[PDB]
Design a binder for this molecule. Sequence first.
Ligand code: CLA
Ligand code: CLA
Ligand code: CLA
Ligand code: CLA
Ligand code: CLA
Ligand code: CLA
Ligand SMILES: CC1=C(/C=C/C(C)=C/C=C/C(C)=C/C=C/C=C(C)/C=C/C=C(C)/C=C/C2=C(C)CCCC2(C)C)C(C)(C)CCC1
Ligand code: SF4
Ligand code: SF4
Ligand code: SF4
Lengths: 62, 160, 132, 74, 80, 743, 73, 40
Amino acid sequence: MIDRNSKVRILRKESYWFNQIGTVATVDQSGIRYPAVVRFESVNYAGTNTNNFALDELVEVK
Amino acid sequence: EIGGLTKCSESAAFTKRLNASVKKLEQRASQYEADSPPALALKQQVERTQARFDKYSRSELLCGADGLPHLVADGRWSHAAEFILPGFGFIYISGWIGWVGRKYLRAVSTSANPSESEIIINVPLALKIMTTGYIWPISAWQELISNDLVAVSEEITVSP
Amino acid sequence: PFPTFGGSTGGWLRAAEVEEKYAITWTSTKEQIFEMPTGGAAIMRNGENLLYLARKEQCLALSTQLRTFKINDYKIYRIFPSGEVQYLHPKDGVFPEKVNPGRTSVNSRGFSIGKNPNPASIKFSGITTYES
Amino acid sequence: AALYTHHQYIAGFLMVGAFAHGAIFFVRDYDPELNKNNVLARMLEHKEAIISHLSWASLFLGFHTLGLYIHNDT
Amino acid sequence: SHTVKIYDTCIGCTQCVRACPTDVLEMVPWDGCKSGQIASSPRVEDCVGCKRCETACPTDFLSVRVYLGAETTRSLGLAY
Amino acid sequence: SKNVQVFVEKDAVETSFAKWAQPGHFSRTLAKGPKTTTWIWNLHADAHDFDSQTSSLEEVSRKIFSAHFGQLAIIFLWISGMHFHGAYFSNYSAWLTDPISIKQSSQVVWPIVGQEILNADVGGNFQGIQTTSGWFQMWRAEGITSEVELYWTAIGGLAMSAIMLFAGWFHYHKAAPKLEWFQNAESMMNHHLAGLLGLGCLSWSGHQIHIALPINKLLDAGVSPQEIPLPHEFLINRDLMAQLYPSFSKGLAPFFGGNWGEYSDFLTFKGGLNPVTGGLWLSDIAHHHLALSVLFIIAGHMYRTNWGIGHNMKEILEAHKGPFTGEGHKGLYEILTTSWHAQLAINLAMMGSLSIIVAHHMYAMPPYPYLATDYATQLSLFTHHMWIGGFCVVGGAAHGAIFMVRDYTPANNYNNLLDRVLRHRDAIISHLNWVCIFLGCHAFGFYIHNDTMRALGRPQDMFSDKAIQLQPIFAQWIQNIHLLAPGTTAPNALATTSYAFGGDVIEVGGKIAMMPIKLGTADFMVHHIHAFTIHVTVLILLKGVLYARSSKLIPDKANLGFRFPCDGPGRGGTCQSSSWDHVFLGLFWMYNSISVVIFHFSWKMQSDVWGTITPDGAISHITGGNFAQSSITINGWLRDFLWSQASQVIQSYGSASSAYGLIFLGAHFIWAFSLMFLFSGRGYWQELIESIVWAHNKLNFAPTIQPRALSITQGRAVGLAHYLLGGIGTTWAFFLARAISIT
Amino acid sequence: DFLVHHAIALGLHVTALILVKGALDARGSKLMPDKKDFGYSFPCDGPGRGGTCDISAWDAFYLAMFWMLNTIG
Amino acid sequence: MNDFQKYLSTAPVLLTLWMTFTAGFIIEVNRFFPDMLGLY
Ligand code: CLA
Ligand code: CLA
Ligand code: CLA
Ligand code: CLA
Ligand code: CLA
Ligand code: CLA
Ligand SMILES: CC1=C(/C=C/C(C)=C/C=C/C(C)=C/C=C/C=C(C)/C=C/C=C(C)/C=C/C2=C(C)CCCC2(C)C)C(C)(C)CCC1
Ligand code: SF4
Ligand code: SF4
Ligand code: SF4
């Protein structure tokens, strides 16, 4: 399940980290469109290591 | 012979090349004299030339009309020394290098700083891993049949 | 109220007189030297200042420099050949980087960039996928 | 001599154009849904494999061909 | 001239509107993000096509996309 | 207290190897660590940009001083090696005895893999590579004679190298000067113009007068090297010197008295070239340096330091202002005393310009014994110094632009010359553009016209000395002036400064050393082409300096920096609009310019100067005088020059010149290789890398330092680098191989 | 003849690589996952994300032309 | 010492040393076993 410190696999095809594993940092509960904040160990082509995804775009890996 | 070639031991052109080459060096040596350091060098060079041609002559190499050795690589073991046997050497060494490299990368991947260990190699570990590559053929096969070598669609792919 | 400048060959051309022109205005508390986008150095006046340029970008570039001098009262206008003037920046009085209640969204698509339609689907339509 | 060089050059242009229009097709006329699990779609699924292997082939041929030529020259 | 579109993945970082060289973008009130703000492109008639905005976006894939199109004196940056 | 004092901080930086193990320490960004391959490249590209590594001028200045010591150490080691190789791996002794026959050689290859073929039969019972740097001639002029002496100078070099390296460490880690010390231009100029140059010249004159002159006279006369007295003997026994030069008998008494005339024996103004060696008379060279020494020492007493008398540069600069130039030169002093980049610009441009002058003056007036007849060495030196010069000149422009983007301050430059220049930049660039077009159309048009005419069977309509002729009247006039100068405008001289202007043919060993070089229509055409090439180079470079901070297209270019890839695909396209890119393009034109110049030298000389002359007056030039009617068309250059003079390299296989053939081919390869970086873009490569990485991942392994494609700017740099190496390398081999044969 | 034939092989393979990659990576890539919305030929996608020069499919044709000429040569 | 060893463990330095060693051994082999176009 998506929750703090959980590990998930990205399912957004446009993501640099598609089919890769990241750690959910925090999940906002205010109804924002993309609540989960996942952090990755690899920088993207822009140099970022984090992005916000929706719960459906994330599948828990364990 | 294969391809209408002739054995170098029986090729006149091959011999002509030898004579000509030696003559050139000897003509040069004539200018210098006796034990002059230049002359001694040229003299030693002719010895090497004579040896090279002799080695090729005693070999199974096949020469063409130009009198130059031509190599055969169709799989026949008669001329395996030309390509097959040397080929095994390359494969063994190349695999060794690749296997050990992959091993080190995967090994240091789980370290405190996986990127510092790629720019500043941990020599002690590297040497250990490097020595363990002599049996790379066996290890690789074992890893393949254990589903530990090839990954399974859990890797990043393009948008389309 | 023109700042003190000696002239340059990098000023405006005919377009400024026949197509369109721009103007920036600001107020200073001291006379200081600034660099003008056209090329060269000029001295602003102690008070109101007005300068004419040929492009909006040139005007906004100067504004950036002005902010360094701690001047944030700049205004940019576009003067047409007939004399008509359009106030352009700050448009609503509040700089664009600061959310101002009363501003409506424009050109917004409610989905991720990857949810745009396929080009083949809109063939012979005249519209583009990103406008579809 | 002229005829051979003439047709071979024309052939090259014709070949390159084919691949060019093939790409134009993918960008403009390809329907992902119609060709579901089609022979064409699956080609775009293992694109990396095709490109990577073609790369290896090019490298192998390039290194050894040039290497052998330079050996002979030296 | 050019077309600039903003997507729901915006986070209201304001970085884009702070990078535009010609004031084409603005920050408008919104509720889809924690910041409570989204970017808009009210004045695309002044876009030069620099794409500085895109370079500033922090989202995985740009939430602000600039599609180059018809060219005018303003878009071609012609001072003459 | 004193205006000029020494201020130094003790123990400024601790010496340790810790930072060595922390790559990227100099930069804040790089220090964080490597995450992509770009970090690696950036580490090497920002290594010596101290301005970005620190914000204090004092620190930047300190690093520069120490770094310079490092270069000096390297240079000393280089010179040391050359002398050593000339002592243990050379045929100097044999050449010294018979300079005309034996060929110079100072490099020998080990007998590995048939590479021994490269060891040629140069002569003197020695086999090695024929060197072309001109060391032997220089050593002879100095009066070396032995190989023991060469060994000792080598040892001195090593020692000096070490001293410099210590100095670098000392003045950075133990005694680092403060900024106030560095900012003392008047003192520095006084010291460098009187001590470094003045005392240097005087010291050299001493060696030439007491050691070189006497020994060389004996050598020329015929005395065997072994029979010539050792150098110290001449210094002690005045009688020996008196025999050669009969004025040393009088001693230094004439000097302290005003009778400097008595020293006419060794201090002379003969002019021309020594008939025996084919080089300038050493007596004249001695007077040259002595005279220059006096001038420099006097000049070193022009600026104020701590005694009131002197000039203050600031005052001089500020006073020089006029009706058309506003505040004039006000503000320049501060710029040149607070910006290293500005100083480098001027200094680098002048240094490069000097190299080009050296190339011209060193062939027309051969300075060393037995150099002119060695065509290989002559060609090598001319081309070498021509190149060094071109690079330096372009570099000056580059650093000038870095100044405008990083150090220029509008406040300190109001209505000064710089400001006024940047205020009419459009006019300057517009006019230069026209000048370039005019020259280019007219100059190159001449060649195209001629080609068409000759091909159409209409030779009478060509711009040739046999048809419509374009004679260089002005130059022809100056030549006559210089020819008739000796005895008229230069009464005390005895001969022309150079035989190029006019005179007789000086021959040494049956080979022509110098001969009057005439100028005709072909020369006019080529000279004007040189003008076109240089002018275009200036356009690109100057545009970069003037439009470095801003432009109508990108009004805020300054903030973007000196080296940015672009501003975007907008405004119709803003690719390559940085000042760095202007330098990038300028180098290509510099390559073209220098290439044409060196080719002109090679063909003109081999056609109208170099060659052999019989005992009677029969001159046979190497190429036969083809330059006049063949260099007037492009086909001529392709056939009578490149195609014909390349017969040597292409047919070098199986000989000691085989290396040149291989390098010729290798250089072509590298040149072509570069075109893939210059025509392609990062996007294609990045995507290809993605697919390749997929493969590695599919096998469960991939680098943490994610592989990325080279940056846009780096791509251009890599391309230019390989392009230049390949082009220059090709000519290098072509020239050297051809020269060896012609010699 | 052996060597020259292998050189021709290199040409065909490398020319093909450029062209094939262009076709497959014409509807999108990791650098530009939305390439299909820009078309067959576009200048670039900006100086960001590392630099996106020659990223369109048209550029593949442009690059392949040179190799085609080389191989035919 | 430890720090110096780290510098000597840097990628550039190690490559040069390794390649020098590799080059050397290849050269030495050719010095003692020269002119070979096949395993005899
Ligand atoms: C052979 C290749 C070639 C040629 C011909 C040119 C030509 C030119 N380059 Mg160029 N360039 C080249 C390669 C070449 N480039 C390469 C490889 C690079 C990469 C580094 C560059 C980079 C470069 C830069 C960065 C600059 C130039 C500039 C110039 C122009 C100089 C002005 C001039 O002399 O106009 C004359 C042009 C001629 C071609 C002369 C010959 C034409 C005939 C003989 C004259 C008469 C013809 C008449 C006008 C019309 C005839 C009618 C009929 C034929 C239809 C000129 C258009 C400069 C420029 O534009 O400033 C002015 C400039 O800044 N070049
Ligand atoms: C039956 C053959 C055929 C047909 C019908 C088409 C048809 C088409 N192609 Mg195509 N193409 C072909 C062969 C063909 N092509 C081949 C063989 C190639 C490989 C080179 C290409 C490569 C290609 C590309 C790369 C592109 C097209 C495009 C197009 C479309 C627009 C063409 C256009 O805008 O041109 C308009 C008219 C012109 C361009 C005039 C051409 C002027 C040429 C370039 C210069 C002439 C040479 C020179 C002047 C000679 C002077 C020398 C003298 C001094 C001696 C159109 C549907 C374009 C497209 O987007 O389609 C979607 C596109 O981008 N094609
Ligand atoms: C002389 C010019 C030249 C050369 C040599 C190359 C070489 C190459 N290009 Mg290329 N290219 C060029 C001009 C050139 N290009 C130009 C002008 C363009 C503009 C159209 C392009 C456009 C282009 C594209 C679009 C692509 C290439 C690709 C390639 C590579 C193909 C694979 C290959 O041959 O591997 C072998 C490579 C070489 C032999 C060259 C390097 C050789 C060095 C010296 C190493 C030699 C090692 C030696 C054998 C000994 C090794 C052991 C030793 C360490 C002890 C190769 C590196 C393709 C690529 O990326 O590859 C997959 C590709 O997609 N090029
Ligand atoms: C400009 C400087 C210079 C240059 C270019 C050369 C060039 C040459 N010299 Mg020479 N030399 C020089 C200065 C120079 N020398 C000086 C100053 C001296 C006086 C000491 C000598 C004394 C000298 C002798 C006595 C001999 C040469 C020889 C040679 C030739 C073979 C070089 C060699 O050893 O290859 C082979 C190279 C090696 C054996 C060195 C091994 C490679 C090392 C290990 C790589 C470096 C490791 C790396 C830096 C690690 C970094 C660690 C970090 C702390 C930096 C070569 C042409 C030889 C020759 O011509 O014989 C016929 C020869 O016998 N030279
Ligand atoms: C008369 C005194 C004197 C002399 C000879 C020099 C000489 C030099 N200075 Mg200098 N300097 C001086 C005073 C002097 N300076 C003063 C007073 C200041 C402060 C205002 C400076 C500040 C200064 C800076 C900031 C820099 C120099 C640099 C240089 C060098 C320029 C490079 C060159 O030409 O290489 C020629 C090289 C040589 C001739 C090699 C020999 C060099 C030694 C040190 C000569 C010393 C005298 C020598 C032992 C002979 C003694 C005579 C005896 C045998 C009888 C050069 C060695 C630059 C440099 O690269 O420094 C490292 C530099 O950046 N100087
Ligand atoms: C007195 C000479 C001198 C000095 C002190 C400097 C000093 C400087 N220059 Mg500069 N420059 C010079 C001459 C000089 N330059 C000349 C002559 C040119 C024209 C080509 C330039 C062009 C130039 C540009 C275009 C730039 C600089 C920059 C810089 C700064 C950083 C340098 C850097 O990145 O270090 C790192 C140094 C390197 C990476 C160089 C390594 C050598 C490379 C790999 C080429 C090697 C070629 C080699 C000889 C070929 C061997 C062939 C063999 C392998 C077969 C620094 C202040 C840069 C800057 O940012 O300034 C603020 C910058 O952008 N300079
Ligand atoms: C009879 C015979 C023979 C033959 C055999 C065979 C069977 C062969 C084959 C061959 C082949 C089989 C070839 C092929 C080729 C192919 C190609 C050349 C292809 C191309 C392709 C393309 C170009 C593509 C395109 C595209 C794209 C890109 C995408 C999609 C769309 C399109 C389709 C457009 C032999 C030898 C003689 C001998 C015996 C008998
Ligand atoms: S492309 Fe440039 S002008 Fe257009 S919105 Fe982005 S930053 Fe502003
Ligand atoms: S930079 Fe991107 S995420 Fe930030 S406000 Fe602009 S569009 Fe939204
Ligand atoms: S990536 Fe290349 S084409 Fe695109 S904006 Fe940058 S420099 Fe221009």
